[PDB]
Amino acid sequence: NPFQFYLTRVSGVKPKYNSGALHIKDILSPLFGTLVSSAQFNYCFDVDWLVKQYPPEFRKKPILLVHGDKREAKAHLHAQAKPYENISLCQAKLDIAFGTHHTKMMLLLYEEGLRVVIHTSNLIHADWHQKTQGIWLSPLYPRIADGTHKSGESPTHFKADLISYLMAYNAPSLKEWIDVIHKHDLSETNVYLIGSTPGRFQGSQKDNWGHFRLKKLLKDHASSMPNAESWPVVGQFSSVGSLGADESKWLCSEFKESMLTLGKESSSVPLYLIYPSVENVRTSLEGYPAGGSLPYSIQTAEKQNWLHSYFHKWSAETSGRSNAMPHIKTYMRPSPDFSKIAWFLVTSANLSKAAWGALEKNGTQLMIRSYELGVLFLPSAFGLDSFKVKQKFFAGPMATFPVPYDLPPELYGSKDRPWIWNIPYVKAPDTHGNMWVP
């Protein structure tokens, strides 16, 4: 396959549904490269667990943890790492209120080259145990010879775009990684980077980040087809922010408008949102504790009941993962019969203004609160007009894209409710015999 899109291993499914999956120990294995230094960008860390995932021969190599924690949370993380002299920390600045360092990325420097991993999992045991999570694995990027002058750039501009994303941190530990990336040849990269960084972006910079970055890439590198109005947008996520009092405030006005862009020329497009129901969580492999990683609050949800008529159940028979609750986030543009897709995005970004950006100042400024990162698969980057949807995720041309959940998405039934993580569920027990009492 050209796509190098993987799911994490799920404990409890039959082997055929893990044969093409990756555990974190597989990613860090010596078979992927001889490690000399790594950077782990994430939100939540279990440092003791994390070090144990590296091969024993690599456990003393330098590790940089890039996080967004402040105050007591920051002190707790430092305390976790202090036993390991090889671990350094970089606190990503979050100068806008209510922002998060959400990006999940590994930079893996080897004797043999460099690898970039952009994924969706926190660095804790539960996130790699029984969840549906997504991974993009870069090629092994070779080092550019000393004294050789070449760009090392891909047709998707991934090298410059990754350096630009890291430059936004203004961090000395990450300038070191920028210098590493400069010395490597990333020309084989066929995905586009879509990042979010905190700030207020106008004019020259509005297209750099968030949903305007997505819009720019779709305008420049996708084409509009006849009956494009009939091609749905699908969004799939593990959390929801405050979107406003009605759909015109952000969801269907600027977010959907960016996602329905195709091509350069100047809405009835259906919008599917996939988010686990209470029943999805109750009957999942983890049971109700899966909902600890689906942090949709009642305070937020009760202000936007209009949103839930867009919600569709989690179903993933294609990958054997209907009972592995999703912490992956994906967005895509299927054809009206869901047999093809115009593009596919895997990302850390949930359905929230903090992650994707919200327009300010009479539409002239895009304000983003958080760090996010994802990769965009466009047919033009593979010499294609569209991707065929792979019928079974782990089955056998290779030009079919492995969509990890079922299409078409199934609307909530009249008795279904979205998972809300801070109210109790005491009517029916989960797969472990328990109720949920927050």
Ligand SMILES: O=C(O)CCCC(=O)Nc1ccc(C(=O)O)c(C(=O)O)c1
């Ligand atoms: O959107 C907003 O305005 C706030 C909504 C609250 C929220 O969703 N918090 C959250 C934090 C960390 C992670 C993670 O890194 O796993 C996740 C997740 O991805 O589920 C979610």
